[PDB]
Amino acid sequence: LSAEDKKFLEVERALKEAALNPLRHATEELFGDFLKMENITEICYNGNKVVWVLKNNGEWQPFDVRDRKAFSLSRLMHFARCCASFKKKTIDNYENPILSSNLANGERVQIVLSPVTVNDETISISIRIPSKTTYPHSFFEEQGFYNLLDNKEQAISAIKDGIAIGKNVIVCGGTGSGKTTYIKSIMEFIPKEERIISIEDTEEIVFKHHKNYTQLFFGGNITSADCLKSCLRMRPDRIILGELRSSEAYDFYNVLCSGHKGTLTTLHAGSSEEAFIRLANMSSSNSAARNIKFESLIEGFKDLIDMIVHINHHKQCDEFYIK
Amino acid sequence: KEAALNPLRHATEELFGDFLKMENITEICYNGNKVVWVLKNNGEWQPFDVRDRKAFSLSRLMHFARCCASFKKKTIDNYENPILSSNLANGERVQIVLSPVTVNDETISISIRIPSKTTYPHSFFEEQGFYNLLDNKEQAISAIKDGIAIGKNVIVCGGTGSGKTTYIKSIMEFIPKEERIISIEDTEEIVFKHHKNYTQLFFGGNITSADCLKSCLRMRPDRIILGELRSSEAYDFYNVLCSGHKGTLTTLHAGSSEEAFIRLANMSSSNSAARNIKFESLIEGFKDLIDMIVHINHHKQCDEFYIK
Amino acid sequence: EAALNPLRHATEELFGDFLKMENITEICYNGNKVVWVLKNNGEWQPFDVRDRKAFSLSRLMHFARCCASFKKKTIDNYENPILSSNLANGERVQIVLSPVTVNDETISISIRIPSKTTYPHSFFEEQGFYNLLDNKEQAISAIKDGIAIGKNVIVCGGTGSGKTTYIKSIMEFIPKEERIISIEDTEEIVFKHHKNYTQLFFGGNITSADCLKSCLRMRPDRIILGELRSSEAYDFYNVLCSGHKGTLTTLHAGSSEEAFIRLANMSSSNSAARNIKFESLIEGFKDLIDMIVHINHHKQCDEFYIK
Amino acid sequence: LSAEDKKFLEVERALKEAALNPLRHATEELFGDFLKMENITEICYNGNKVVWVLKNNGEWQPFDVRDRKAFSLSRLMHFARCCASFKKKTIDNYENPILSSNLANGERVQIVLSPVTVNDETISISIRIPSKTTYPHSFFEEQGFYNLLDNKEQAISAIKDGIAIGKNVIVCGGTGSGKTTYIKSIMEFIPKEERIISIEDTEEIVFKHHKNYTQLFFGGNITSADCLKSCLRMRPDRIILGELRSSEAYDFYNVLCSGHKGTLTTLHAGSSEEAFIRLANMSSSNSAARNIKFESLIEGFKDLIDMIVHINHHKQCDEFYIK
Amino acid sequence: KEAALNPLRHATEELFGDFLKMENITEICYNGNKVVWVLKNNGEWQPFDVRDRKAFSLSRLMHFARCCASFKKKTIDNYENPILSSNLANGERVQIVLSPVTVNDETISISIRIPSKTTYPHSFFEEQGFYNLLDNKEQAISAIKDGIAIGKNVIVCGGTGSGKTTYIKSIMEFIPKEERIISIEDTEEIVFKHHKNYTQLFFGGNITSADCLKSCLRMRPDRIILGELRSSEAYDFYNVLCSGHKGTLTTLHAGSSEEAFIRLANMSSSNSAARNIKFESLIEGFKDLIDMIVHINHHKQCDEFYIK
Amino acid sequence: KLHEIKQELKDLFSHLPYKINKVEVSLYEPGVLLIDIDGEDSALLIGEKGYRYKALSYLLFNWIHPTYGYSIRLEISTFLQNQEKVMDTQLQSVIMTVHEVGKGQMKAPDGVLTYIALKKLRKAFPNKYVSIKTNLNDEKYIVIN
Amino acid sequence: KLHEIKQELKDLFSHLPYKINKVEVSLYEPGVLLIDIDGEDSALLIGEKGYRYKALSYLLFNWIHPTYGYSIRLEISTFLQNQEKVMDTQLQSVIMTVHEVGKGQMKAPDGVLTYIALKKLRKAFPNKYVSIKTNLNDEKYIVIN
Known part of the structure; x- marks a missing residue:
């Protein structure tokens, strides 16, 4: 009976992992290189092909991402929708252009879209690192x-x-x-x-x-x-x-x-x-x-x-x- | 009443029987790491290791929790109801907390108030x-x-x-x-x-x-x-x-x-x-x-x- | 008067002696074979009813359901253990059952006399x-x-x-x-x-x-x-x-x-x-x-x- | 076209009268003799076979109605229900035992039922005369x-x-x-x-x-x-x-x-x-x-x-x- | 626009045409009893009897009221909408009240504000x-x-x-x-x-x-x-x-x-x-x-x- | 009750002559009676833009609902089912806005059309709050949010 | 999408063996997928008093709704259809209290039973406010007023 409960726990873990996988994949695709950095407090994307990292010592460091397919509009909208759906929210260019959500390991994400941002090609993302x-x-x-x-x-x-x-x-x-x-x-x-x-x-x-x-x-x-x-x-x-x-x-x-x-x-x-x-x-x-x-x-x-x-x-x- | 009562009594005895027989105690706590903490009347917490006890497994603790819930026509689970306030068979208060309110999958918090x-x-x-x-x-x-x-x-x-x-x-x-x-x-x-x-x-x-x-x-x-x-x-x-x-x-x-x-x-x-x-x-x-x-x-x- | 008769007989059988008492204001049963009567002078008087078949749990539950039925309400040992109702004439009754009462064998009844x-x-x-x-x-x-x-x-x-x-x-x-x-x-x-x-x-x-x-x-x-x-x-x-x-x-x-x-x-x-x-x-x-x-x-x- | 409008007005009057007839009949049955009285301000029924009339000079005058079929409980409940339905309200012995309504000529009626009144055989009625x-x-x-x-x-x-x-x-x-x-x-x-x-x-x-x-x-x-x-x-x-x-x-x-x-x-x-x-x-x-x-x-x-x-x-x- | 406009203009002229042509007036009122009241700029109310005018019947007044309502995509009736605020064709304000808000079946209140x-x-x-x-x-x-x-x-x-x-x-x-x-x-x-x-x-x-x-x-x-x-x-x-x-x-x-x-x-x-x-x-x-x-x-x- | 209603409507339609041919009273829905009137003088009971039809529908409700406990559906010739069909266009069009957006609105139709519209909008749109709100212009709109 | 779901559920049921014979995924209602599982080891997925069934129904929702946009109806053998039939008794008893009184209440059932009960009670009872309120004892009740 303990062996049946021990086995069902593995079914639960597999189903939890299944739920988190699209978010975990979309996160790695965009921010993997930056989330792996040592001594970071915040990662910001401002809608113009630069990822900004804030270090523990208070220094902001920019990184060009104009070369990366991941920072396309549709891939950024995919990531935002994964974030939204993870906390049972919606994000859109109409009534819900502002989102407060989380990533899989629990870090806070703030996402802002048009028409709250400057134009339709501008997506704002702010990730707080615990x-x-x-x-x-x-x-x-x-x-x-x-x-x-x-x-x-x-x-x-x-x-x-x-x-x-x-x-x-x-x-x-x-x-x-x-x-x-x-x-x-x-x-x-x-x-x-x-x-x-x-x-x-x-x-x-x-x-x-x-x-x-x-x-x-x-x-x-x-x-x-x-x-x-x-x-x-x-x-x-x-x-x-x-x-x-x-x-x-x-x-x-x-x-x-x-x-x-x-x-x-x-x-x-x-x-x-x-x-x-x-x-x-x-x-x-x-x-x-x-x-x-x-x-x-x-x-x-x-x-x-x-x-x-x-x-x-x-x-x-x-x-x-x-x- | 006794169809629901017997499972809980035996599960309580199996897990906390040695601690519930202790005299001049006010609280029994389990934090999900093989240690039963007893608060004495003099205000001292005393830790008892239960890693060597077969009685303490995730499934047995989870069986006890559900028995504790059913006794008071309540439910406990890792979904909508991970927090429970209930009673043991003789009426002592029980607070049970499960994941995702506890730190992980394998952590069950139990707090028993001894009247x-x-x-x-x-x-x-x-x-x-x-x-x-x-x-x-x-x-x-x-x-x-x-x-x-x-x-x-x-x-x-x-x-x-x-x-x-x-x-x-x-x-x-x-x-x-x-x-x-x-x-x-x-x-x-x-x-x-x-x-x-x-x-x-x-x-x-x-x-x-x-x-x-x-x-x-x-x-x-x-x-x-x-x-x-x-x-x-x-x-x-x-x-x-x-x-x-x-x-x-x-x-x-x-x-x-x-x-x-x-x-x-x-x-x-x-x-x-x-x-x-x-x-x-x-x-x-x-x-x-x-x-x-x-x-x-x-x-x-x-x-x-x-x-x- | 037909639907106003099985309650009358149920009340008569249980509380008849107490209801006919002069200068009273309350009648209480606490599930323990004692009927407590509060007099107008402010004193409670106990009456032992242990030697009566009329105060059986099956009898008291019949009375309880009659009071419930009379005011178109329900009383049970689940969702509805507390009842506010009236006797046939009009006196207010409060009935409490298990699990709100202490145990299996306990019914609480309170009758307010105008x-x-x-x-x-x-x-x-x-x-x-x-x-x-x-x-x-x-x-x-x-x-x-x-x-x-x-x-x-x-x-x-x-x-x-x-x-x-x-x-x-x-x-x-x-x-x-x-x-x-x-x-x-x-x-x-x-x-x-x-x-x-x-x-x-x-x-x-x-x-x-x-x-x-x-x-x-x-x-x-x-x-x-x-x-x-x-x-x-x-x-x-x-x-x-x-x-x-x-x-x-x-x-x-x-x-x-x-x-x-x-x-x-x-x-x-x-x-x-x-x-x-x-x-x-x-x-x-x-x-x-x-x-x-x-x-x-x-x-x-x-x-x-x-x- | 004026002759068609003049004709349709008579259809409206007939349908208005049809609506008011059960109230007008129930009113006459119970309170006809009292509503015809000169110099009256209020008519009260207290649920014990006495109709109380308050005159303009401030005098209350009682009238026995124990002999009248109209002051039966069911006839009084019929009247109350007519009053209730006339102002699109309900009156019952449960959640709506209190009613504020009107009679056909616009006089105010206050009706109280059991369990707000003393017992199930007690119906209270107060009619204010304009x-x-x-x-x-x-x-x-x-x-x-x-x-x-x-x-x-x-x-x-x-x-x-x-x-x-x-x-x-x-x-x-x-x-x-x-x-x-x-x-x-x-x-x-x-x-x-x-x-x-x-x-x-x-x-x-x-x-x-x-x-x-x-x-x-x-x-x-x-x-x-x-x-x-x-x-x-x-x-x-x-x-x-x-x-x-x-x-x-x-x-x-x-x-x-x-x-x-x-x-x-x-x-x-x-x-x-x-x-x-x-x-x-x-x-x-x-x-x-x-x-x-x-x-x-x-x-x-x-x-x-x-x-x-x-x-x-x-x-x-x-x-x-x-x- | 002019399919809805013509009926109202003719109905207005038929009823209040003689009064709308009056100079130095501020208000025209009808109280449902064959009298058109005109308020002059000097603050005097002047009554004009219209009992001899065929134009003033219950049906004509009611036709005018509905025309006045429709012009502003509104409705007027003796049921849910017995009170109307609307306008004449040239824009002057009209307040119309019908039974059961007026005293009886045959009473129509009309108030026209002259700018x-x-x-x-x-x-x-x-x-x-x-x-x-x-x-x-x-x-x-x-x-x-x-x-x-x-x-x-x-x-x-x-x-x-x-x-x-x-x-x-x-x-x-x-x-x-x-x-x-x-x-x-x-x-x-x-x-x-x-x-x-x-x-x-x-x-x-x-x-x-x-x-x-x-x-x-x-x-x-x-x-x-x-x-x-x-x-x-x-x-x-x-x-x-x-x-x-x-x-x-x-x-x-x-x-x-x-x-x-x-x-x-x-x-x-x-x-x-x-x-x-x-x-x-x-x-x-x-x-x-x-x-x-x-x-x-x-x-x-x-x-x-x-x-x- | 159905007998007394019909007895009164035939009664009335010959104390003041209309060429009235059919006067049927029947149960239509739970708590609703269909009153169905036809004849040659049927357009005279509909009136200029349905004003008489609206008057009759209110007056029949005010008599039948307090007296017999029934709500009513009035039909004179094919008037009402034409109005319901015309209303159906706009109304399918409103529910497509409220599904592509979530928020919608349509001006309250004349007489009992509003109440027919309410039930139909309240039926596509559990679970959403369909109610009738009034404008600063005193204009009534059925609103869904 | 239906393919990816089934591919993952069969996948999973043989990285950790259950005697699982049918795993069907089909469209059940607008926006709802039926997931239907059977076999000899079906009662091992239902669990002591349906705790595993409840766990699975939440876990399938938390995966399928965020990723594919569908809510879930889970069936293991005839478990759910039995629970729905049992719930149907008390649920008609409630509907008859809410029509003889206007006010009613039933204790919230386990897992998605609550949500099935909500829709069914929300369907008899437009126009009435069916919602889930919690009492001083922290006991959840579906309440109709």
Whole structure:
């Protein structure tokens, strides 16, 4: 009976692979050479025979693809349609010219078509590459992450001791600030005996110091809030929420209110004050928060967030907010 | 009932039997990597390797999961229903998560909540220093004893494992023995040591917590004991309060009294019938009707006793 | 009367002895061979029915299905374990079965008996209802003259204060020529001085607000709203503004100042009150309510508020 | 061609009469003797073999109908179903036990059934009789209408001169205060040269001093607001709005804002302050007013209403509000 | 077009021909009782008996009504469509109401609005004392002349017959001749005495006033003249303003400047796209963008000239 | 009931003479009666652009639906089936727009034609929301989205 | 396309042996393909309470719908036709509650049974809002109002 279940698993895997094959093939045909590059964060196509690669160090590098059959309009439309259909969406030159989707290994794809782009021969593609390499916190201390703070060693102690005792911490910055790489480094300071539950859409967080953990993933008809609701029934000591983007920010607020300490998350913000505004604005789109004053939403987060670390565009902390 | 019951009982014993026999435990967890984690009452996680056990295979874990689902007329699969909240045969809560919500094909997450089924007298709480941290200590004990005798609306709040249900059972002494009690629960936890006239209600399947709340209003209760507030039924709970019966007891997850009120209004807001009500009015409504909130800390002591 | 007979015999066989008892308000069966009766004095009396074949699970289930069939509803151990129905005459019944009840062997039955008693107001005077008041004889004159002339009156207090009992006795002072419309959940009000009246009842998909709306289209002289609970307080408020005389109602509140606050907060939970300030609501009720009688747990008036 | 149109009109009248006949017959069967009574305002049946008649003088008179076959349950349910179907509604002992309808001559009917009434053998019926008789304003002056006002002759001058110059006037009171009878009496003081347009659901207003006028009526799929919209396209000097009941009160507010003076209306209120509250609450249920502060709605009416005359239960003015 | 046109023209002449030839009239009304009421420019209603005219029968009046309806691809009947807004052949507005909205079977209400088609120069307005009531008289004339030259958003408000459109035509002198003008109208009233580069848009049937507003934004106007604000298109008119073209002219029914703002917000509110926007924000938006409001009284004089 | 209706329509057509030959009343669909009228004076009951036909169809509904519980289908000569055929062209043309785009619209036809059009559009287009919406010009359109 | 699908399903059923004799792919409805599988090892593809049948029906959808644009009807032996007949009983019982009351509900069936039930209930019940709502117990119900 186990041998029949073991055999049927192979039927499932073959059928999953069958589904992903047209996307995996269309991806390799266009972006294979670029996806294989080391230390990349983003790949962009702008509709004029140049592929732009953004490296981890912040440098944009162009590549001519005028010679490649893969960057024909029909082959780019094929790829876009595979992307669309993979997340059960449509992309067209009419009512759906904008697509947010994913590639097979889970990287985010943004596609824009005419008439949103400049002309009918212009197709825009942006692929975000997930944070892969894991750095120890020593790397941040050695490479000058805290150097802009006029209280360097006091701030480092505060993050270490705050993470250890179970303070609610948010790490914010813009895209490519290294938010996630930094969250992972400070997981070192969560006592090894704590049961961690992480919530992400793709696997980025790594567990180097913890043995009792479960990773939860959202996508399709499973939302981040569905994972958070499940998380609370799984007896966690620590909840790591990969990123806040929209309405789940208010689900996160209710977790903070439920007597749960020691939460760790990231969002896109330019400072601690902008983080609170961003939190309140993301929470606003939620059912429970539809009749809540913005000012009450803001004050609610301010009473509950212990530390905010903001990272600038040069991967240094420029604000260490302590409550 | 027993055609569905036997498969689950044997599957539970096969997998978690050695761990369910353990004393003074509060949680059993499986993370899909041959280790059974037990959380003890003293707050220590203890790992038990089960790689050498034939009982732990993907198919046996998956058989147990489906048995757990069917027992509560639910379904679990790797498709539309990869998250399950259900129960073991004797009623302990089970959270099961499958791929694609777990990291891969071969990862099954299982979390079993072990109830503290022992019932302490309130005298035992007093003697162990439950109220000892409090500045308003003597006024709290008097409010618990006299307030619950007259008939007041009390919420016991705190985190998981803080012993909210245990404390609730203890304060039931102070409800006069003559009063008719109606309880509303997910699982049978509340006991009736002092009351002969009572009816237990249990929600599941087609019957929601809110259907039990509406029913209890037509069953002439003196006291209504709602096991726990979780979501939209907080709005129906507020209606139960507005029809001013003698008193109510309930539990909630909150870190303080002020967070309890925010939390009550938040849960009521997500109800369709409250979609055009000001959040302020929801809060204020609960502030009118709730008489005492007892917050229990992580060391099982009251660190805040709110009295209206 | 044929389809109104197998229920009569089923009710007769099971609850006959208990239904014939005088001065009762509730009959409960909790699935454990004990019939609990609530008397008008507020006391529960157990009756052991273990030595009766009539309280068998097969018999109780026959009764349950009769109540279901009578109101064209269903009751089973699956999708439909909770039933709201009526006995042949009209008394409300609530039946709960497994799996909502504790086990296989448990049926819950609750029967609500309508009131048919009214205390005279002279009873309240001689039992010392007004004795806590420094202005006793003025307060008695004020309640009698006020109800007669059409003043808006609220009677408040807690469970077991006798709010409804008192409000029913002061109905004596409404002139007998007045057309009265009452709005209730359960039949408590008894009409002994008025021959022109209509009773309205809410429940299910019919709200208190619905009866209030209907009431305004039924040419009433007086409106008696049994009790104020929540959002209908706003509908009640508009009735106070629509040019009628002398609305009577009850409320759970501990004083006049608590009453106005509770009135304003109850109104604020109405969808139509979304854009109204709390301050406008409270001042509104204060401008319209003439008298508030608060009764304590000893069933005496400890606050007599006059506008 | 005129002879064919004249002939087809008789086909229309015969088919209208055919539709109304079952209602007209069921009405006569039950309430014929009572509807023929002089000086009546309401007829009520309470579900216990007594028909209650309310006279113009405020007296309730009972009539036993235990002897009449017409007051059987099935005959009463037949009548109720005729009433329901006449306004394209249903009445039943389940989801629709409450009915607001009309009789053939346009009188309002309110019907309540079990389970809203006390038992299955109880049917409630309330018939409102329209204000018929027209009184001259001299009747009001002679019979002591203004006698409670401590500035009698000044108030009478104010109403006469205010109506003449085109002030916005509201007459309020409870049911049977004689609101409509009073509106009609003060139409005397609108200059005879003014084009009046009235808006009602049944014909109550009479035109004794005016020759240039049009009566508009709402019912079914024609709302009061539809008539008000049409009215503004019909070049009126004076707009008489029979009664304010719900959302059309905000349509009436916009008319006042459109630079239209000399409007005349009634509503149910117990004083001038209660009239403003009532106006704001009725306006609240309207589309344009869904996001308007109650306090702004109140202040808006207070800036625009010139006079409010309130009538007590003894048909006397107890408040003469002047702006 | 002329298969539908001829029946209406002859039916109009048969009924109202003698009254439409009358000079200095503003309105023709029929109330269903053999009397044609004519409103003169001097504000006097004059009754003309038509009981002796064979032309006035129920069937002829009903034939005219249907002809009036068909001309504008509309329907009129005693059933779903008893209220009609339409036009005569030469474009004058007609309001027709039938039973059951009128008092009986045999009552037809007809209201015909007679446009004042004569165009006065602005000098004529100044000379007749249009601005003479005003305290801010000279600042008003300067704001009209200089403000409209630079490009400002102005609303002309007042009641029916106050001559709003007439006044609008006069102030068009002060729009520089080089500017491209787009007008949006129900009926052709605006004239172009000073501008060679212009396009007239007319709404009807499938094309709403809002469709014309959206179209004009893609037709590169310097000035947009919207005939009148009536309802939901006030929200689309606000969008026209937000895209900051050089200037706009429009009319509205309001008793003052503050009532104009309330009125603009009220019309915008009844739009589906504005259902979750605060009424305050709507008002404020208009207060930001509207530069001058000219209110004309019942005697055709400005009694308020609002300047931002 | 069918008897009482026919008894009343023959009754009426000879209290006020039309050359009316057939007056049939029959069950057409669940809850719908066909009233079928013909004769030499049949075009006199259709009227100028079908105004009398429309009046009759409303008036028969307002009598028969409240009294007998039935909706009606009126036929005078071949008038209605001609109107349905003409309507069928435009209507097949609307459903081809709503299938090549997803969104469509057609002006509401005269009288009960709108309601026939509604059911036919509601039938090709489960699962899509067919309803009748009104223009800023007060023009009625059947809208599908 | 029908060829590529069958070529892949036969392909797969002999890289991991099941006694599989028929694998047909055919057009079933507009935009719907019937995939029909039989053999001695047919019950091994249905699985304990149809869990493998449900898995296969989702997996075939997730492959065929994104790549070929077709939705799927899966049949293994007579499994689906039996489930449809069983579901037909309760489903007529619902339709008779929604016609004697107007309001109804049935618990969402397993896998594509829900979607078959939706279409059938959406067909009796234009014009009525057949949708799938979830309760406080996280139990899915098909609801008609």
